[PDB]
Every structure is written in C-alpha cells, then in structure tokens.
Design a protein around this motif. Structure first.
Motif, short mmCIF file in Angstrom:
data_model
loop_
_atom_site.label_atom_id
_atom_site.label_comp_id
_atom_site.label_asym_id
_atom_site.label_seq_id
_atom_site.Cartn_x
_atom_site.Cartn_y
_atom_site.Cartn_z
N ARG C 103 0.81 -1.21 0.00
CA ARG C 103 0.00 0.00 0.00
C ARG C 103 0.85 1.27 0.00
N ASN C 104 2.05 1.21 0.57
CA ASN C 104 2.76 2.44 0.94
C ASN C 104 3.23 3.25 -0.27
OD1 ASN C 104 4.80 0.79 0.05
ND2 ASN C 104 6.14 1.10 1.82
N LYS C 106 3.30 4.99 -4.06
CA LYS C 106 2.30 5.69 -4.86
C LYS C 106 2.17 5.13 -6.27
CE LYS C 106 3.37 10.29 -2.81
NZ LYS C 106 3.32 11.73 -3.19
N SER C 134 -1.55 4.40 -0.60
CA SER C 134 -1.21 5.62 0.13
C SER C 134 -1.22 6.84 -0.77
CB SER C 134 0.16 5.47 0.79
OG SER C 134 0.43 6.59 1.61
N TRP C 372 -4.89 8.73 1.11
CA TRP C 372 -5.94 7.80 1.59
C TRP C 372 -7.28 8.48 1.44
CZ3 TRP C 372 -5.98 2.85 3.91
CH2 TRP C 372 -4.73 2.26 4.07
#
Ligand SMILES: Nc1ncnc2c1ncn2[C@@H]1O[C@H](COP(=O)(O)OP(=O)(O)O)[C@@H](O)[C@H]1O
Ligand SMILES: Nc1ncnc2c1ncn2[C@@H]1O[C@H](COP(=O)(O)OP(=O)(O)O)[C@@H](O)[C@H]1O
Ligand SMILES: [Mg+2]
Ligand SMILES: [Mg+2]
Lengths: 178, 314, 373, 167, 120, 411
Positions: C103-104, C106, C134, C372
């Motif tokens: 997720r972290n 981009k 993220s 988010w």
C-alpha cells in the motif's frame, strides 16, 4: 462452447480434492457417501455422453468438470472392452475386472491431462484418490452393462459400438500406453 | 584460413570482445547475438532483443565493454552489462531516417552514427539525464553515409558517402576534449570542418579506413577502385583501377599495405609505394576487421558475409 | 524518489498492454498484454506437462494462450469485465513482475479524455478500497505526452489499441472543446487484417488466433506513402509478397494486405466507420482553434501510442496535412506552400507515457497526490 | 546475323557485373525498404542502363541500382503466327510471378518479359543459378515457340480430316 | 479530395595509312564526357563505329592489347553505345570486339561503365 | 438486342444454365467434368497433358456422372474455381453444346461467390473476352440476386428491399445484409459449414458404424439420407434419449442398389438424421476452428449494421440455396434469435429501472419455393432489363484497359 458441463456442484456439497468428490450412488465402498436423489455424477456422465464426445472443445467451468471428463474417459474404456463381450453376463464380470485396474491417478505420470490436474499432496488425499477413483470405476461399469447390452440377444448394441472409434477431445485413458 | 557458419542468412555486421573471446553478430533480424569460444564450436550466451527493426551496425567498446547498435529502427542503444544482463540506454538521435553505420572513437567517450538522413550524428553522455545526446555533421553531406572510421586523435572522422566522395570531418566535441593536437590534415579544426574531399565523381564509397599513422586514408569504391590518399604529401590521392568486381570493405594491415574484400567473396591485398604513390595489386564479403595487432601490424583478420558465417586468416 | 524513501509507479492501464515502471525511469521495466484467461481442452492440441493455473494472467497467458480461453478486461478504454480487471492489477503488483506488493508506494493512473465518468470513479474506488493505496493520481493522458516530450504547446495524436484521440494543448492550457475521438485503433486494424487474409484463404477464428495476427500486423504492415505508388508496385511486381510462420509452422504468405490494412486509419470508410481519416480529423481540429493558435499547432504535432509506429506514418501524415493546407488555406496557390512551416514530432521512442515529468518533477513530497482520502 | 554463342556470353558477363546488390533502407520515406529501380525516387542510386543486342529485333536491357536490378528481353518474332503464340506464352508464365520470384507481373513497354531481382533474392538464392536461369530462358524460348507452331499445324490437320472424312 | 494534389516533390588519314591501329589510338582523343553537349555525343560514336567495323579478325586481338587500361575502359563505353541502335549487321562486329575487350578489361571494366556518371 | 442474354451460374455443387427472361433454369446439372483416363501413360514424364485432339474427348454434367471409362473431376471448391484448365473446357461445352449459344452474339451474366479473389475475376474475364470474344459480361453478386427473387415473388405489400439473406449452398455459407437496395459490404460474414461438409460428416458417421456400404457408393447414399431423412431437432441430448428409448421407430431403413453387382444392400439410418443439420448450430462438430452457432453469427451481422436498419433486418431474413431446405431449419434459427434479442432488451429495461419498456423486436425467417435456383432466377430477372445491357462491360473496354476491368468488387 455449449457442451454439457457438470450440473451437480451445489456449494453445500463437500469439495475434497482437485476435483469434485461426489456422493457416488453404489453398493461398492469408498470415501464418498450415498446420493439419494435419482440423478448422480455417474448418471450425468452417462446421460450426456453421446453428445459430449462430439464437442471438440471443453472448458473446466467448475471443479466438478475435472471429475466429469475423467468419468467420460473411463466410459469410453468400458466400450473399448464390452464391444468384445460375447454376452451380458461376461459384460458384467469382465467389467469388474477393469474397474480394479491401476488406472493412472491424475497426478501420476502417464495420465493424459497432467497440465489440468494438480498433484495430490499427501497420503490423505492420494489414498483418498485411489479409494475414490476406483469407486467411480466400480460403479460406472455396472451401469453400462445394463444398457449397452440390448435385451434381445446380448449382442453389444450397435448404436453404442459406433462410439468406440470416438474419444473425448481425442484423449485416451490408455495414456502413452497400457 | 578457417571458416564457420553461424546462420544461413546474412550476418549484416559483427563486433568483437576486447580479448576476442566473444563476438556479436546480427542474425538478419531485429536482434544481436553474442557467442563464446566454448571449444572450437561457438556457444550463444546472451541475446539483446530491444530493437524494433533490423540492426545494421555494432561496435563493442574495448575497454569500456559496452556495445552500440543501430539500424533501420532509427534507435541506437548503448548496452551496459548491468550484472548478468545487458541493459540498453536511450540515445536521443534526432535522425528522421534509417541509421546505417556506427563506430566508437578510440577514447571510447564518443561514437558516431551514420544515416540516410544525410547527416552524421556524433554522440556523448549526459550525466544528469541518463541518455546520450547528439550533434550533427550536416553541411556538405548530400547522400546517405555508408561507412565511418575514426582517426587515432578521436577527433577526425572519415566518412564514406553514397555521394561518390569520401570526406573527413573534425568531430571535435568541446564538452569532451581539449582542443585537438595539430595534424597534417590541417591545423584549423572546429566542429564540422571539412578536412578532405575526394577528386573523383563516380561510384559509391562503401568503406574507408585510417592507417594507424593517420597520414594515410584509403577508401573502396563501387567502380572497382581502391584509392589511398596521403597527408604527408599534399593530400595527394592515388587510384588503382582493377578487373575485380566491386569491393565492399577495406582496412589497413601495415602502414604501407592494405587489404580488401567484396562481391568476389575473397580477400585481396594492395601495397602502397611511398615514392611514386603507385598502388599495386597482390590478390588472392561485407566486413573486415583486424583481430590482433590493429592497423599498425595486422596478424589476423576476420570477415563476415551475406553468404553467411565468418572466416579468419593469416 | 520520495524523501520518505517511498517509490512511485506508473501504470498505463492500457487497453491492450499494461506498461509499468518506477518514477524517473526512461524505460518501462515490464511490458505485458492485458490477457486474462482460463484453461480449455482443445482437440487440435497435445496437452503438455506445463502446469496451467486456474487463472493465467498477463505475459504467461499470452505464451500459453494455446490452452487458454482469453479475455481482455479493458475494451475501448472502458472496463468491461471488472473481475478480470482486478485480477490483472493483483498480478501486476504481486510478487511477480513489479513487486511493490504494498500500500505504501504511490501509483499514477492515466485516463483517456472524454471517458464515461463511472469508469474513472470505479478505478478511484478500488485503488483505495482494495489496495488501500497511500498515494494515487489520475492524469490527463494527453498531457503526459507533452511532459515526456518536454513541450508546452502542441496537438497530441494518441492512437492506442482501443481508441484514437486528438487533444490540443496551447502553452499548457487545456483546450477541451477541441478534443476529438476517432474510433479506429490497433484492435480494429487487426480484425480488418483478419478479413483481408480470409480472402487469401487463411482462416483465423480462435481467441488465441487474435494474438497471432497482431504479431503479423506488427512485423509486416506499413502505411503507404503515396497510395497510388503502392498499388502500382503491387500490380506491377511481386516484391511486396512476404512469408510468415504461424505457430503450427504453416508458411503463410501475405501481400498488398501489408498496406491495405493500415490504410484504414486514413480511410475509415474501408471499415464501417463513417467519418474522416486521422489527418483530416487532425486538420479540422486545428482549423477550429482560435485563429492565432493555429500557427503553432502546425509546428508541434506530437505522436503517441503504438498504432503510430507503422513505417512511414509520419511521412504519410505530413503529406496529407500539406495537401490539405494547400487545398483549403492557400486555395491552390501551390508555390506559396514553401512558406508553410509544418513539423511532426515523431520520436522513435513512442510508448510515450513515460513518467519522469509526471512524477519526480511534480512531487518528491507534496500535497498534490490524493492520499488515503 | 550475330551467332548465338558470342551474343549469350556478352549478356552473361554484363549481368554478372550488375548483380552486385546490397540492402538499402530508403531515403525519402521514414523506413520503407523498396527496390530503387522501380520507385526511382532517388536518382544517385541508379546505374547507367546498358543494352546488349544481337540484331535490331533481339536485345536485352540491363538496368541496375544499389539494391535492385531489372532485366528485360525481346525475342525474334519470326512470323505473324509467332507473335500470338509468344505473347500468350508470357502471360501464362507471368501469371505465376509469385513462383518465378524474380519475375515482374508486367513487362516494360516494348519488351516481351522482364525480371526484377532484389537484394533479398541474391541473399536468399544462389546468384549464379538465377543468371543461369535468365540465360537458359534465352537458350530455349525460340525452341519452345516453334514446338507450339508444329503442334498447331497438327491440330488443324486432324480437325480437317475429322470434318471431311464423314462426307 | 485533398490527397489527389501531390505535394512533397585526321582519323581517315591514319586509316588509309594502312596501320589503322594508329587511327583507333587517335579515335580515343575526342571524348565528350565532361561536356553538357548532346549532339556531339551523337558525333563521337559515329566516328568510332566506322573504325570498329574496319578491322580484320587478324588484328582485333592486338588492337585491344595495344590499349592502356583507360583505353579498354574507354572502348567499352563505345561498345555499349552501338548496341543501342545496331546497323544491319554491325552487331556481329561489336560482339567480336566485346569478346576481346572483356578478355583484357575483365568484368571490372564493365562495372565502371555501369557506374559511369558522365559518358561518351 | 434481339437475342436474349445467357445467364450461367456456376456453384461448387451444381451449375445452372439458360437464357434470360425464362422463369426457371433450363439446365440444372452437377458441376462435374469427366476427363479421359490412361493406364499410367501420364506419369512423371508428363501429367494429364494431351496431344492432337485427344483433349476434346470428355463430358460434363449428368453425361459425366455415370460414364465408366472416365475420371470425374470437380473444378469448383469452396465456390472458388481451383483448376482453370478444366473450367475452361467446362465453359466451352456449356456454350457450344448445352446452351447452343454463339458467344460472339450474346451478353453473359455470370456469378461471383462473395469470397473470391480478384485474380479469379481477371481469369474469368480473360475467358469470356479473350477466349470466346463475348460482346459483354457482367459479374453479379449472388446474394443480391437471391433477394431480388424473393422481391418479385413475394406480395407487393412487403417488397421491402431490405433483409438479411442466408445463402447456405454447397461450399461456404454467406450471411449478407442488404438495406434498401444497398449491400452493407462491411458486415458480410462467411461460415464454412455447407452441404459438402454435412455430407462428409454423414459419410464418416456412416462408415464408422455401417460398413457394408460399397466404397464406390458411400457418397451417393450419404447424400440420399441427407436429402430424404434428415431434420433439425428441438434439443440435441433429448433426441439421443428418444432414439435410445424409441429405437424401434425413430431408426429408419434405406435400401440401395449395388452399382456393380446389382444386388441390393440395406443400412439402418439413425443418429445421422439430426447430426448433420445441427452442424450449422455446432460447427465444431465438423471443423476444428469454427464455433459460433449460425443463430449467433447472424446476430452479429445485424448488430454491426447502422442503428436504423437493425430492426427491419430482423423482420425479414431470407433463406437461399439448397442446404437451407432442412426441416425446421427456419423454426430453430428464429427461436434462437428471438431468445437472444428479447433477452438483450431485458438488460436495457433494468438499466432504466423498468421506467420504459422497449417495443420488442419481432424476428422472421422466410422460406420460399425459389430456394433451389433463386440465384439464377434473380439473374434472369436482372438480365432481362434494358438497364442490364448498360451495366455490362462492352468488349472494347477489355481492349483499352487490360482484363483489370474486373478487379473491382463491392466488398
Ligand atoms: N511496431 C509496431 N507496429 C505496429 N503496431 C504496433 C507496434 N507495436 C505495437 N503495435 C500495436 O499497438 C497496439 C498497442 O499499443 P499501446 O500503445 O500499448 O496501446 P494501449 O496503450 O492503449 O494499450 C497494439 O495493437 C499493437 O499491436
Ligand atoms: N432436400 C434437401 N434437404 C437439404 N439439402 C438439400 C436438399 N436437396 C438438396 N440439398 C442441398 O442442395 C445442394 C444443391 O446445390 P446448391 O447448394 O443449391 O448450389 P451451389 O452448388 O451453388 O451451392 C445439394 O448439394 C445439397 O447439398
Ligand atoms: Mg494506451
Ligand atoms: Mg451456390
């Protein structure tokens, strides 16, 4: 496309293995229980057989199809033997002699569709596969004996013997050799 | 001599590793294949796939160990051995037509790509944006450029035009070099200065080479002539008319003797008399490269042809 | 890259090819087709020992397509099978290929202009409801070309697999009303090539066959420079005929179809589409623009997308614009045309959605990314 | 007038000097590759066209370029019946220019048949055997014409008896 | 519509002197090659094919061999001119000079005829 | 002109001859030619090449189906002419023997199968102009003529000039849409299933089961059962269950005569009856590489046509050529289309909340007695008109241009 795909995969049914384990209605013994309704996976493979063998393409729509395609191949192997039978009585016992033969289990080499069936990972599936796939064959044979031999003369009936030359997508349960 | 066939179809160009233990060749397609001397036989080791059309030129920078390739794709890529994989690199060639030839300069800091665009593109590396950037030699070119060779000074670039004429240009990139040392081809040399131009007017020039002393060039021409031109004399050309078919490739092998090959498919040999300037023919397909000893004193050379394969000599 | 050490990725989400790389890379690291598919038994093929998963995806589904019933999840820029679409991204970011797996880091998205709004919004949902990313941004597909090309004024011609677009940008201002679409793209040229080979008696009909005629298209086809000269050279001489090897080794031969198929971009009436060819739709767009801006669009035509790769297309395109300007602006005053400065940016690099300008020049760390929320 | 063996030998040697092709991506279109003899868009890639001729009727034109060479032939039409037989002979042959890979689908105006040899052929096929084919074509064509003339007599001579005999 | 409108574009005194080889050596003194002229090129050939037809076969060997390498290359350009419009039988003689000339010059002497950008 | 034009329609199964203006073809004959044979006198030294006048000893049509001492050849395959030597010999005897026409004085209308390559249109034109000196030729699209045959036959209140025609002759099946007198060339589709492959499927299906059929006559009996007993069934697997349970009566008997011994032979006819016609609905039964049912190929055609004409095309589908004659063949295709079309509208109901109900498409599939020769009869009603004589190419045009006057085609 519109080949007859397996109907019975109601999600409430247990789904052991890489294939639908299904409640084979028989007086033989095995891991699968007893279906009580009038329709069953062996009856399904028998019923759709004459149509299925003409369709030159066939998807796996769900897990039960990896059962049905194997039942179909064994049904073909029945005809490859019953055609020789001199009478229905031989057509039963010489069918039982086929059921208890060491057919390649889908994860074993020489099975024709090793790309499509995953390996059975452990004894408690592998030994289940040995005890299930025989229970398929043992029953499947006894059902064809009753209806390949038309009752007038215990000839193996011509209409069935026509299909002896035809194989489901040209795959053979003789594998690379018997 | 010895012979080997890598493929049925033309080997359009080749290059060699520094220690000659590997070759790069293009199998008449949009790739280049690298072979290793695994015994007498050759084993393929790497396969550079990135081009989108037939490649037509390779040079394998000896000390830097990096390969340049160009072709009809227009693209050129310099390939870095980034571990166990050759990775390409963009070159912002501004050319609007097919690339035709490439060679690295002796200092391996720059290279030049010829093309049908009627230009030579000289290249050097930008450090800040990871690509190689071009400047064009453009003024008296008027037809496709077929062959390039770099003077020992890494500045003068002889170039065979399909314009019946052989020309020498100073490719002096000031971003990469001090102003070049004086040379008999002329002290005046900014970027793109026209150092020399052949007297004749007929037959395409397929090949050019500089002797290891830069004072003699020779070029090889579709009118079945080989010419040599001498800067210790006043740029005086001498031409040998010959009864061979056209010759496609030439290289020096000593300071006063020369070797060529062509559509007769066999090597031929010339000598240059320093007194009268007369060439002479000694006799015996598409490239020649000296394997050992350079143009100062050749002791082996290699030839690859459209007929397929390579040969090695004596 | 980010001062937090986070990486940033671009997905073109292409209708035919997903194309992926990290921010600032001059190359995509992975190019792979968007095929998703299931195993199918076929009589005409020996079933191998190669294991086929119950869902092959991406590059694997292309090489093993001979066993597979394959779908494209994306059609004409709209997702038409949303489940296979999810599975294509779940493959892209998984351990295989572009293994961010997180997720972290981009992601940049590229959307075609004039895109049905729900299509855009479902992507923005699943990116935050499923991958829980993220950082996400959706960029105007047309501007990314000019960022990569390093320009601020020019008209972007953007023929992908699914749809062709023309979008002017003038000194960074978006002129939306001068947008146009032409519904001719690499997929239609392929189907049209199927029909042209059908006349020459080769049958292609399986979904696995569509990839094969695409590989034919990419290697043999070209756009005629002077279509009369191509027709005469086909009629007079044999040199246009060239061989190809199908998967089964049939040495098929293809001829003038090499140029008759790509020509459909300039002649939509060869396909069922009624309209004007790419050159004339481009010319009408410039002519609709406000009068002083036209002088610059003629000098900054910019090409994008794989269907612009056909040999000679820049040359053919320039000819039709010069002739259109002669016919309709100079009114046949032929000799004046020496004054018509026109130029086409046709850089040989033309998977032209590279990321340098859109990411690193836009943010190392910033409040621009949607986040988010 | 000129005898066969000296005339054929001259054509062979000339054609051997013209068949010196190389691949060449065109200058005037972005990356098209095309035979310069046909498109003629560049005019410094062309060789000087030369004719070899046995007499005023029989001649060969050799016309080269850096990447392609064209050869066109004219044969002695020795009488009116032979004009028709010759023209139709070419057409049924030329109608397979996709199997005679070196053969143009149309002749040049004022020539009977004409071959276009590209660099791809000289790279993919043995050069000296293509030239032998072009030579063999001239060694035979006027035998192949005359043999039809003998047979066309015979057909009519049968047709006459088949009609007259039944009187 | 739019795509229709294309855009983008002394000898006699040597002959009758008997040693007629000295005439041919003199006939090569009049090349029009460098000039832009065209009527002269029609004169240049006629002054030579008149010479070529005069030789006995006892001499046509030496008449080539007595030329220098430029002489053979010069001669071949005249040979390929007479073939462009034969006399009633003179092809029988040009093909006989060609035999000798090609023996001396080799196919290389043809190639610098095919590539000759300016010609007699 | 005074003399009528000839109309010669050549198919891969049959050819259909006669002068224009007649109501009906004057010869229907099989497309076969029986050339003379030798005891290997033709060999590696020379194959099938004749001398003197030995080439004129041959016959065509029914005069060539039953001659013992000749090798039967079939020049036309998938509608395309494959061996022009035999086709030209075929054309000569059509003209100078069957039609009695002098080619130099009658216009010809001659038919293009919508698949054929332009080279074949050059060669066919080279025959008529340069071999026969025809004064003028026209090459007609077979499907448009079939529609004109319906148009003039059907009631004037519904002479729509708009419809999709399905032309399953032998060779290949064409599905072609015509809107208000214009062929929508972009939408034409070809299905490879045709009368030959249905014959071949039945021939194999018999030869596996019913050996006893003599090899000389396998093809004849396969054709007979196809023509006389075969039908399109309601549900494939439900027939197999009926044929098992009522095998006393769905099974049939065919009696053939041995061509050599003149003994009779009998075969049981069974699953052959409904396999075959269902190959149109399951093409993978006969071909490795075609799979869309004919009932779903025809839908794709209309759905590619311009939006306004779509509904009218469903209202008027015309069946053409002999293979479309199978029992219930119309009923099933109409049922499959109807079940597809109204289900498609069920989606657009829900995407609008049932707020409006679309006027459902009615679909019609139309059978008419012309089916065995609608292509020729259309051709005759065209070639009668004074307009026809100006659409044809006059012979001088073949002189000034090359044969290239027939390169063009409307696809
Ligand atoms: N060298 C080439 N020549 C011709 N067509 C190509 C070439 N490379 C790719 N294509 C075609 O371009 C299309 C894919 O282009 P792409 O830019 O990836 O579209 P998208 O990004 O919308 O998926 C496909 O039709 C592919 O066949
Ligand atoms: N009763 C019938 N039922 C089904 N098909 C038939 C029947 N009679 C004839 N046929 C088919 O019609 C064909 C007749 O030729 P047809 O298809 O009309 O012309 P073409 O040869 O141009 O295709 C026969 O080959 C056969 O395949
Ligand atoms: Mg795209
Ligand atoms: Mg028909």
């Amino acid at each position: 496309m519109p080949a007859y795909h397996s109907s019975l995969m109601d999600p409430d049914t247990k789904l052991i293995g890489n294939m639908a384990l299904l409640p084979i209605r028989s007086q033989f013994k095995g891991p699968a229980p007893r279906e009580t309704k009038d329709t069953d996976i062996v009856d399904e493979a028998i019923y759709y057989f004459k149509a299925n063998v003409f369709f030159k393409n066939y998807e796996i729509k769900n897990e039960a199809d990896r059962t049905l395609i194997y039942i179909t191949l064994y049904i073909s192997e029945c005809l490859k033997k019953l055609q020789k039978c001199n009478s229905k009585s031989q057509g039963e016992k010489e069918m039982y002699t086929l059921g208890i033969t060491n057919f390649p289990i889908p994860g074993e080499p020489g099975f024709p569709l090793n790309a499509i069936y995953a390996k059975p990972a452990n004894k408690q599936e592998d030994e289940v596969m040995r005890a299930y796939l025989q229970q398929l064959r043992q029953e499947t044979g006894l059902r064809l004996c009753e209806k390949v031999f038309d009752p007038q003369n215990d000839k193996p009936s011509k209409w069935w013997t026509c299909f002896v030359k035809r194989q489901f997508m040209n795959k053979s349960l003789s594998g690379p050799g018997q | 001599m010895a012979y080997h066939s890598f493929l049925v179809e033309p080997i359009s160009c080749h290059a060699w590793n520094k220690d000659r233990t590997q070759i790069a060749i293009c199998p008449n397609n949009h790739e280049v294949h690298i072979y290793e001397k695994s015994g007498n036989k050759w084993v393929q080791v790497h396969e550079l796939k990135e081009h989108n059309g037939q490649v037509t030129g390779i040079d394998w920078a000896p000390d830097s160990n990096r390969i340049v390739t160009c072709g009809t794709d227009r693209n050129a890529y310099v390939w870095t051995l980034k571990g166990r994989t050759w990775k390409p690199t963009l070159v912002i060639l501004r050319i609007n037509r097919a690339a035709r030839c490439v060679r690295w300069a002796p200092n391996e800091k720059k290279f030049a790509v010829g093309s049908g665009s009627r230009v030579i593109s000289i290249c050097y590396f930008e450090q800040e944006n990871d690509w190689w950037v071009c400047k064009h030699i453009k003024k008296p070119i008027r037809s496709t450029v077929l062959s390039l060779d770099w003077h020992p000074n890494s500045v003068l670039l002889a170039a065979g035009s399909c314009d019946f004429k052989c020309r020498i240009f100073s490719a002096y990139i000031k971003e990469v070099e001090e102003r070049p040392a004086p040379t008999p081809w002329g002290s005046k040399m900014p970027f793109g200065e026209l150092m020399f131009e052949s007297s004749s007017s007929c037959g395409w020039v397929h090949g050019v080479c500089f002797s290891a002393n830069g004072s003699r060039v020779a070029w090889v021409s579709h009118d079945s002539t080989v010419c040599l031109a001498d800067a210790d004399k006043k740029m005086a050309v001498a031409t040998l008319a010959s009864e061979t078919l056209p010759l496609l490739a030439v290289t020096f092998i000593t300071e006063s003797s020369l070797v060529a090959a062509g559509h007769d498919c066999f090597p031929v040999l010339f000598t240059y008399d320093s007194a009268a300037g007369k060439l002479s023919f000694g006799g015996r397909v598409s490239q020649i490269s000296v394997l050992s000893g350079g143009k100062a004193k050749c002791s082996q050379f290699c030839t690859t042809g459209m007929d397929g394969g390579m040969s090695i000599w004596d | 890259m980010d001062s937090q050490g986070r990486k940033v990725v671009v997905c073109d989400n292409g209708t035919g090819f997903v194309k992926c790389g990290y921010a600032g890379s001059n190359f995509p690291e992975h190019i792979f087709p968007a095929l998703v598919g299931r195993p199918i038994i076929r009589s005409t093929t020996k079933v191998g020992n190669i294991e086929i998963k119950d869902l092959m995806v991406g590059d694997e589904a292309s090489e093993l397509r001979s066993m597979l019933e394959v779908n494209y999840p994306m059609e004409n820029g709209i997702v038409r099978n949303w489940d296979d679409m999810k599975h294509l991204w779940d493959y892209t970011f998984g351990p295989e290929k572009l293994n961010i797996d997180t997720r972290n880091c981009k992601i940049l998205l590229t959307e075609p202009p004039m895109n049905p709004t729900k299509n855009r919004e479902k992507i923005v949902e699943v990116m935050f409801e499923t991958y829980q990313f993220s950082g996400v941004y959706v960029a105007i597909q047309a501007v990314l070309t000019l960022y990569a090309q390093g320009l601020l004024t020019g008209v972007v011609v953007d023929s992908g697999d699914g749809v062709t677009h023309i979008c002017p940008v003038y000194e960074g201002f978006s002129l939306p009303h001068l947008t146009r679409r032409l519904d001719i793209a690499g997929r239609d040229i392929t189907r049209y090539l199927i029909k042209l080979l059908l006349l020459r008696g080769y049958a292609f009909n399986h979904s696995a066959d569509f990839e094969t005629v695409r590989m034919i298209k990419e290697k043999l086809c070209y756009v005629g420079y002077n279509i009369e000269q191509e027709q005469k050279l086909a009629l007079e001489t044999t040199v246009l005929v060239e061989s190809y090897t199908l998967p089964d080794g049939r040495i098929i031969k293809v001829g003038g179809e090499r140029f008759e198929a790509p020509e459909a971009l300039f002649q939509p009436h060869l396909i069922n589409v009624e309209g004007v060819g790419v050159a004339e739709l481009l010319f009408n767009t410039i002519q609709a623009a406000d009068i002083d801006t036209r002088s610059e669009f003629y000098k900054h035509i910019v090409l994008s997308g794989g269907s612009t790769m056909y040999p000679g297309l820049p040359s053919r395109l320039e000819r039709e614009l010069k002739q259109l300007y002669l016919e309709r602006v100079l009114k046949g005053d032929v000799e004046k045309l020496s004054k018509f400065k026109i130029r086409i940016e046709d850089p040989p690099r033309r998977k032209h959605m590279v990321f340098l300008g859109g990411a690193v020049l836009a943010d190392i760390m910033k409040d621009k990314d949607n986040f988010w929320m | 007038t000129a005898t066969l063996r000296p005339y054929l030998s001259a054509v062979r040697a000339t054609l051997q000097a013209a068949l010196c092709l190389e691949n060449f991506s065109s200058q005037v279109v972005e990356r098209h590759n095309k035979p310069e003899v046909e498109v003629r868009s560049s005019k410094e890639l062309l060789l000087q066209p030369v004719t070899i001729s046995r007499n005023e009727k029989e001649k060969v034109l050799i016309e080269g370029s850096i990447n392609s060479v064209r050869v066109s032939i004219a044969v002695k039409q020795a009488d009116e019946i032979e004009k028709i037989l010759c023209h139709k002979f070419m057409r049924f042959m030329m109608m397979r220019a996709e199997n005679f890979f070196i053969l143009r689908r149309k002749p040049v105006e004022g020539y009977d048949i004409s071959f276009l040899i590209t660099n791809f052929h000289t790279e993919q096929m043995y050069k000296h055997k293509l030239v032998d084919f072009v030579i063999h074509f001239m060694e035979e064509i006027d035998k192949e014409i005359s043999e039809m003339k003998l047979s066309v007599n015979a057909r009519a001579r049968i047709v006459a008896e088949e009609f007259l005999k039944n009187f | 519509r739019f795509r229709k409108v294309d855009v983008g574009e002394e000898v006699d005194s040597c002959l009758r002197q008997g040693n007629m080889t000295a005439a041919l050596q003199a006939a090569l003194k009049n090349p029009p090659i460098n000039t832009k002229s065209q009527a002269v090129k029609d004169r240049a050939g006629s002054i030579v094919l008149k010479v070529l037809i005069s030789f006995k076969a006892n001499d046509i060997e030496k008449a080539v061999q007595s030329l220098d390498k430029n002489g053979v290359d010069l001669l071949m350009k005249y040979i390929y001119k007479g073939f462009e419009s034969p006399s009633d039988n003179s092809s029988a003689v040009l093909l006989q000079w060609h035999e000798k000339a090609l023996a001396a010059g080799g196919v290389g002497s043809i190639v610098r005829v095919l590539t000759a950008r300016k010609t007699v | 002109g005074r003399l009528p034009a000839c109309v010669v329609d050549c198919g891969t199964g049959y050819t259909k001859l006669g002068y224009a203006g007649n109501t009906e073809p004057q010869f229907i004959i099989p497309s076969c030619i029986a050339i003379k044979e030798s005891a290997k006198v033709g060999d590696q030294a020379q194959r099938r090449v004749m001398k003197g006048v030995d080439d004129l000893d041959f016959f065509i049509g029914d005069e060539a189906i039953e001659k013992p001492t000749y090798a039967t050849k079939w020049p036309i395959r998938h509608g395309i002419v494959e061996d022009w030597d035999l086709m030209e010999r075929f054309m000569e005897q059509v003209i100078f023997k069957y039609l009695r026409a002098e080619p130099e004085d009658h216009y010809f209308l001659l038919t293009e199968p919508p698949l054929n390559t332009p080279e074949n249109r050059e060669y066919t034109a080279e025959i008529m102009f340069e071999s026969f000196n025809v004064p003028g030729l026209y090459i007609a699209v077979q499907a448009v003529l079939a529609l004109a045959a319906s148009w003039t036959s059907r009631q004037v209140g519904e002479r729509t000039l708009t419809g999709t025609v399905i032309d399953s002759g032998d060779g290949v099946t064409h599905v072609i849409p015509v809107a208000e007198g214009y062929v929508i060339g972009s939408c034409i589709k070809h299905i490879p299933i045709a009368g030959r492959d249905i014959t071949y499927f039945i021939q194999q299906l018999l030869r596996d089961r019913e050996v006893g059929i003599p090899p000389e006559q396998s093809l004849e009996t396969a054709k007979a059962v196809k023509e006389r007993y075969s039908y399109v069934c309601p549900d494939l697997v439900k027939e197999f269950n009926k044929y098992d349970t009522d095998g006393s009566k769905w099974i049939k008997q065919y009696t053939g005569i041995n061509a050599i011994s003149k003994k009779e032979f009998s075969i049981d006819v069974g699953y052959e009856r409904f396999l075959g016609p269902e190959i149109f609905f399951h093409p993978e039964f006969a071909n490795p590489d075609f799979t869309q049912p004919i009932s779903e190929v025809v839908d794709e055609v209309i759905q590619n046509c311009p939006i306004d004409v779509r509904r009218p095309l469903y209202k008027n589908i015309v069946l053409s050529g002999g293979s479309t004659m199978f029992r219930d063949f119309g009923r099933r295709l109409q049922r499959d289309l109807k079940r597809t079309v109204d289900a498609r509208l069920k989606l657009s109901e829900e995407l609008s909340g049932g707020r409006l109900k679309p006027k459902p498409i009615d679909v019609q599939v139309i059978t008419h007695h012309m089916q065995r020769y609608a292509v020729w009869f259309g051709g005759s009603m065209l070639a009668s008109t004074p307009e026809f004589y100006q659409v044809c190419h006059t012979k001088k045009d073949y002189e000034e241009i090359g044969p290239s006057i027939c390169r063009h085609n409307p696809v």
